Design a protein around this ligand. Structure first.
Ligand SMILES: [Mg+2]
Ligand SMILES: [Mg+2]
Ligand SMILES: [Mg+2]
Ligand SMILES: [Mg+2]
Ligand SMILES: [Mg+2]
Ligand SMILES: [Mg+2]
Ligand SMILES: [Mg+2]
Ligand SMILES: [Mg+2]
Ligand SMILES: [Mg+2]
Ligand SMILES: [Mg+2]
Ligand SMILES: [Mg+2]
Ligand SMILES: [Mg+2]
Ligand SMILES: [Mg+2]
Ligand SMILES: [Mg+2]
Ligand SMILES: [Mg+2]
Ligand SMILES: [Mg+2]
Ligand SMILES: [Mg+2]
Lengths: 147, 105, 187, 51
RNA sequence: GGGAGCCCGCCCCCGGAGCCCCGCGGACGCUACGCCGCGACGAGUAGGAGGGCCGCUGCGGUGAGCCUUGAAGCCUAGGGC
RNA sequence: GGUAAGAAGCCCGGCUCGCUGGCGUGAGCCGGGCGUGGAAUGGAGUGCCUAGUGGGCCACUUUUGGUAAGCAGAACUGGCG
RNA sequence: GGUAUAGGGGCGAAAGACUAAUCGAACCAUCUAGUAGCUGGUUCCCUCCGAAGUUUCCCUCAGGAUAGCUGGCGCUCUCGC
RNA sequence: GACGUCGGCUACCCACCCGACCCGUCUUGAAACACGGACCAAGGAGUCUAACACGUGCGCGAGUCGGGGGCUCGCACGAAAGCCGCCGUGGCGCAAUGAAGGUGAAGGCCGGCGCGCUCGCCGGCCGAGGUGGGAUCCCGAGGCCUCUCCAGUCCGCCGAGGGCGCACCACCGGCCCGUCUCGCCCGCCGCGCCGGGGAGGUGGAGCACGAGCGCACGUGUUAGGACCCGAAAGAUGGUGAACU
RNA sequence: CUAAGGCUAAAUACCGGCACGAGACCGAUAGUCAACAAGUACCGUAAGGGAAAGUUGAAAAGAACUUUGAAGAGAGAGUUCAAGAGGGCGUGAAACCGUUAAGAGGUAAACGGGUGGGGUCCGCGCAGUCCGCCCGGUUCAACCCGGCGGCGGGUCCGGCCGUGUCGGCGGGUCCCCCGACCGGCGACCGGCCGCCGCCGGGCGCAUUUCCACCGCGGCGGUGCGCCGCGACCGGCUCCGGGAC
C-alpha cells in the first residue's frame, strides 16, 4: 500500500529526504559489488572475511545423490515408530526389543547425540557412529548394518 | 554500495530480461483446456482405462532414493516371454512395452 | 531559559499491545484492572509481558518447563507462561503439571492432559489466583532466534565468532583471504 | 457442518488434518469476572477523591 | 468463649442509616482505543518518527443515504467552524 | 593527566594442584562472621536497524609562515552555520 | 543538359576546402529511456526528537567505504507505594 | 434605550502609528552588481519486479509450506472459491566441522575386576554441570490491633530473616570436527604401511532440553530505465553529386 | 550403446491475421500518432518526419414577417422549459479587457500587528427581558377484584440441560444407564413466593390530573446592547505611622 509508505509524507519537502548538500545521484560509488579491492575494501574485510581468494580442490561433475546421507540422533529415535510400540516396552516380561528401521523413515546415518531411554532396541542403519553404538550397547540393544 | 553488513548479492538481471518475461495468467485457462482434453480422450475410449496402458514396477537409481518404487515405461521383452505375451500383441491390449530395458535381478 | 536536554525525555516502552485481536485486548483490560488495583507485582509483570511482541515472548518447550518445575520447593505450583507451550519429542516421561499459557500446541496439550495435568487460561488464572499466589512464572529463551548469531562483534575481527551473512555456505564462497593464514591473514 | 469441520474433541472427518482453533480465553464476559467474589476479596480500597 | 468494669434485658435491619462514607447496588464520568488529576517542558536547517473527523480517484460492505419540488461543476461585498 | 575513597571489602576454618618450593609458596575451590565507607547532583543498564554529514567560517586566549592582509595553517572553549 | 566518383568514403591548382543553408568525418531510422562521481527541479498540515563538514583506507582531493554525530523500535531492572 | 437606533471578532474600501528588502537554489556567507522566474490554466518527477537484512501482525509449531499437478462449472458474480494415500516429491529448519578422503556432539556418582595407574573393563543410580547478579514465587519469627482481663481457632497489612531460583549477562568447567606434542593399550574374517581409544594447547559461522516455516506490512541496501530532464560519443542498416 | 541413412502426432510458443468475451485500467493535453474524411493534412530530393481537431437542441421546431443600412451588421416579432442553448452553438473558471457603483491617491506597488471611519448584507427587536422544576393563592393514582406479560429466589421443589470424577466395558480416539458429590455454570421449562407494568370493574371528590393568572417565594443556566457599584481572594507598584 503506497498510502502507508514514506513517499506520501515527503510531499512539500524539496530534497525528498536525500539531503540538499549531497544530492541523490545515479551511482556515486559504483554499480553492484564494484570496488571490493579499492574504495570499498574496509566493508568487505570487516563484514565478509574470506571473500577474495581460492581454496580447496575442484570437483568437475558433482552429483548430490552420491553424497546423500541424512542423519538422525539418538535423542529422537523412538519418534520414528508409533507410541504404542514404545508403550509395549519394559513389558510382556520377555524383552521384546522392537526393531527400528531408520531407512524406512528416510535416514541412513545414526548419530549419538542425546540420552537413550533404558530399553533394548534393534536399530538397522546404513552407517553407525562409535558413540551411538556405545549408547545402544550400554542400553542393551544391538546395531544391525543394512546395505 | 555496501552498507554495514548486508549480504553480497549477484542478481542475474544484467541482460534485457524485461523482453522475455513469461506471465502465468494463462494457468487457469491451461488447466481447463487440459481437463477438457482429458475428458474428451476418456470419452473416446469408452471402456478402456482413461490413464492408459499398464505400467511396470521400477526401482530408482541414484542411491539417494534407492528404495522408492515407481511406474516404469514398459515391460521388458524377457518379462513378456516369461508371462507368455507377444510383444506386438501386448501393445494392442493395453500393456506398455519397451525394448531398451534390461533385466539384471 | 533552562538548559535541559530533551533527547531522552520520551520513554519508548510499550503501553498497549500492537495486535488488534480482541481476546488479547480483553485479557489486557482484565490484567490492567488487576495490576492497577492489587498491590501484587505478578500482575504488573503479566501485563508487561502481554504488551510484548512475538519475538519478546519466545515459546517455552515442554522439557524446559518440566526441568524448571523439577527444582525443589516449587512443587504443586501453577506454571504461568505468556508465550506458547510447545511439545518436546525427545522426552518420554511427562509429569502432571498445572500450566497457564496463551497457546498450547495440540501435541503438547494431548501429552499434558494424558499425564493428568491441568491446562488453564489467564482469565481462569484470575479467578483461581487473582494475586498470582503459588505460581511459578517462566519464559522461553530470548536469545533462541538465529538473528543473535549474526549480532555482536563484526566478522573479520580478531576474537570474533559471529556468523556472517552468506548466500550459501561452501568451499569457495568464504574461508579465503581474510580467514586463511596461507591467504594473506586471519583474525 | 459437524462433518465438515468437527468439534474440539473430534477430527473433521472430511478434512485430512484439521481441528477447530482453541480459545485464547474461555470466560469472555469481563463483567462477570471483574465482580466475582474471588477477585473482589483481593482488591484494595479505590482512591476516587479528586485532589 | 469464659471472667468482669469506671438489678436485668436490649446494644435491632439501610427497600431505609439518609449520607464528607454506606465493605447491600452503584455515574451526569464507562466511544476503558473512554474519561479524570497532578507537575515539568515548548528554537530549528540536513534528517528521522507519529497523528490527521486534511484532500483526489476507483473497488468490497454499509447509510430503507441525497437528487428534475433540482446532482456534479462554477461565481459570490453572505453566516461560521 | 591517571588511579583510591569498601559488600565485586575485610577476618577466620578446611580441601585441590602433572606449577614453584628444604620445610614453604602461589592460585583455585567450599563453610562461617562482620554493611550507610568524602561533599553535592542525578534513575540507570543493555540490544537491533538507521537517514543526513564527510567544502566550513568567526571570536577571547596560546601559536607557525609571511612586512602585512577581511592571508595561509594548528590547540582549548564558545558561537554563526 | 547527360553521365561517373557516396561517408573513415568521394573529390580537392591544397583553404581541412566542398560533399543539397550542417563538414577536423553528411543525412535518415534503430541499438537508446546509452553513461554522467557533474548542473537544475522534486507537489498537504500539525506534533516530537534533532546533526556534520571530523579519524582511517581508496589513481583518493566536486566521490565513496569505514568510525563519529542523529532518529526509531524495544528489552532488563530500582522506585514517594 | 430602542423604527433609522443596536451586535457582527473574520472578510469590501480607505486612513493613521510601529514593523517590514523577492521568492527557490549552490553556498562559511544572498536583498545582492550570483543563477531561474511577464501572467494564467491543465499535465509534471522516489514507481514496479526480483534478491537480501531487521522490526511488526497473524496461523501452525519440531515442524511448516503450497510451487506445480489433479478432482468439483457450462466463467454472471469466477479466470474466484473448496478439496487432495498428491499433506509432500521438493524448499527451509532440525548438526556441525575439514581442501578432501572422512568424522560427527554427555557426562557425573557409587561398588567391583587390572596396582584405581587421573589409564582399561564390568553392574546400579542422577540425567544438560558449577559460581555471582537475578524480575517473580515459598517459608516466615514478630509487630499492628480489636469497648476491660485471659484463652483463642480465623479475615488481614507490614514483615527482620531464611530458600527454590525464569529470561539474560560475566566467568569456570564439559562435549563435537581440523591441527600440533607426549604416549599407553585394545579388536579382528582376512594379524597389515589395518582400525579404535587417552592426556595436554590451539583453529570452527558448533552442542550444551529447540524455533522455525508460510503469509502480510514498514524501513534500509542493490540489479534492473530505476526520482525526473540533460551530453561531447560508439555501433548496425539505408538515402543523397537538383548546391558544390 | 551401436554413430557417420530416414519418418512420426501429444503435452509447448504465438505484441501478425479472422471472429468473440472480460476488466479494482484512461476518459479528449488522458487512452494507440490517430474517439473526428489519421498514417490524413503538411514538411524534406530521399531514406523518412507527422499533427491539431468530440459535445446546440427531446424534437430544427435552425428565428416566418416588419424596419435602418450597399452589406457585414442591428431593432422588433416568433420557436423552445431554456438562444441568459442562435450552426466550432452543453456547463463557461483564471490570466486580460470595456463600462457601471463606491473609496482613495506627491516617498513604486504590495505585506504583518492595533485601532478608527465608510459601505455590504446578516441576527434581532416596535422590550428580548429567556425559560425549566418545586410551593402558595376533565378523570383517576391511594386501596381492593379478575385477566395478561415480565423480573428474582431458594427447599433444586420435579424433569430436561449441562461440566469433572467415581460405577456398568455396557458400543488409542469417538458413544449409551442409573446412582453420588461437586462447578448448578444466564443451557430450558412446570408449579410456589415476593415484586413490577398494562387492561377491564369499582373508588364522585380536602386525594388525583390539563389549561390561564398573581406571586420574581426556593433552585439552575441566562441578561438584546451600553454600563456603573460593593465586598472577598491571588499577584504586583507605592504611601503614612509607630516600636527594637
Ligand atoms: Mg498422467
Ligand atoms: Mg550548508
Ligand atoms: Mg591549418
Ligand atoms: Mg532517466
Ligand atoms: Mg568528482
Ligand atoms: Mg526522542
Ligand atoms: Mg528540540
Ligand atoms: Mg556543487
Ligand atoms: Mg564562494
Ligand atoms: Mg535567497
Ligand atoms: Mg530571465
Ligand atoms: Mg495540476
Ligand atoms: Mg541494511
Ligand atoms: Mg539522453
Ligand atoms: Mg570507444
Ligand atoms: Mg489525443
Ligand atoms: Mg457555451
Amino acid at each position: 500500500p503506497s498510502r502507508l509508505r514514506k513517499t506520501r509524507k515527503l510531499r512539500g519537502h524539496v530534497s525528498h529526504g536525500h539531503g540538499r548538500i549531497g544530492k541523490h545521484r545515479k551511482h556515486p560509488g559504483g554499480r553492484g559489488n564494484a570496488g571490493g579491492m579499492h574504495h570499498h575494501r574496509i566493508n568487505f574485510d570487516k563484514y565478509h572475511p574470506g571473500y577474495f581468494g581460492k581454496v580447496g580442490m575442484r570437483h568437475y561433475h558433482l552429483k548430490r545423490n552420491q553424497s546423500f546421507c541424512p542423519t538422525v540422533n539418538l535423542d529422537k529415535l523412538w519418534t520414528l515408530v508409533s507410541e504404542q510400540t514404545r508403550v509395549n516396552a519394559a513389558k510382556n516380561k520377555t524383552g521384546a526389543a522392537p526393531i527400528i528401521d531408520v531407512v524406512r523413515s528416510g535416514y541412513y546415518k545414526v548419530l549419538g547425540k542425546g540420552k537413550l531411554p533404558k530399553q533394548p532396541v534393534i536399530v538397522k542403519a546404513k552407517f553407525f557412529s562409535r558413540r551411538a553404538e556405545e549408547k545402544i550397547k550400554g542400553v542393551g540393544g544391538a546395531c544391525v548394518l543394512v546395505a | 554500495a555496501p552498507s554495514r553488513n548486508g549480504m553480497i548479492l549477484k542478481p542475474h538481471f544484467h541482460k534485457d530480461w524485461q523482453r522475455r518475461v513469461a506471465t502465468w495468467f494463462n494457468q487457469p485457462a491451461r488447466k481447463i483446456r487440459r481437463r477438457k482434453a482429458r475428458q474428451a480422450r476418456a470419452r473416446r475410449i469408452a471402456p478402456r482405462p482413461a490413464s492408459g496402458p499398464l505400467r511396470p514396477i521400477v526401482r530408482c537409481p541414484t542411491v539417494r532414493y534407492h528404495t522408492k518404487v515407481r511406474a516404469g515405461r514398459g515391460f521388458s521383452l524377457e518379462e513378456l516371454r516369461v508371462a507368455g505375451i507377444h510383444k506386438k500383441v501386448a501393445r494392442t491390449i493395453g500393456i506398455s512395452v519397451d525394448p531398451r530395458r534390461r533385466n539384471k535381478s | 531559559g533552562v538548559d535541559i536536554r530533551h533527547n531522552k525525555d520520551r520513554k519508548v516502552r510499550r503501553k498497549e499491545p500492537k495486535s488488534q485481536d480482541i481476546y488479547l485486548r480483553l485479557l489486557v483490560k482484565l490484567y490492567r484492572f488487576l495490576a492497577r488495583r492489587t498491590n501484587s507485582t505478578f500482575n504488573q509483570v503479566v501485563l508487561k509481558r502481554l504488551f510484548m511482541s512475538r519475538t519478546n515472548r519466545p515459546p517455552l518447550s515442554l522439557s524446559r518447563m518440566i526441568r524448571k518445575m523439577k527444582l525443589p520447593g516449587r512443587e504443586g505450583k501453577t506454571a504461568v507462561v505468556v508465550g506458547t507451550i510447545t511439545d518436546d519429542v525427545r522426552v518420554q516421561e511427562v509429569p502432571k503439571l498445572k500450566v497457564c499459557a496463551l497457546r498450547v500446541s495440540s501435541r503438547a496439550r494431548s501429552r499434558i492432559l494424558k499425564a493428568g495435568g491441568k491446562i488453564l487460561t489467564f482469565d481462569q488464572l484470575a479467578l483461581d489466583s487473582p494475586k498470582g499466589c503459588g505460581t511459578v512464572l517462566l519464559s522461553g529463551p530470548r536469545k533462541g532466534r538465529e538473528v543473535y548469531r549474526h549480532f555482536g562483534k563484526a566478522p573479520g575481527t580478531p576474537h570474533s565468532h559471529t556468523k556472517p551473512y552468506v548466500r550459501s555456505k561452501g568451499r569457495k564462497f568464504e574461508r579465503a583471504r581474510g580467514r586463511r593464514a596461507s591467504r594473506g591473514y586471519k583474525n | 457442518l459437524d462433518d465438515l469441520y468437527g468439534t474440539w474433541r473430534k477430527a473433521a472427518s472430511l478434512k485430512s488434518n484439521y481441528n477447530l482453533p482453541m480459545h485464547k480465553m474461555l470466560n469472555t464476559d469481563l463483567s462477570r469476572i471483574l465482580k466475582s467474589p474471588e477477585i473482589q476479596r483481593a482488591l484494595r480500597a479505590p482512591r476516587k477523591k479528586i485532589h
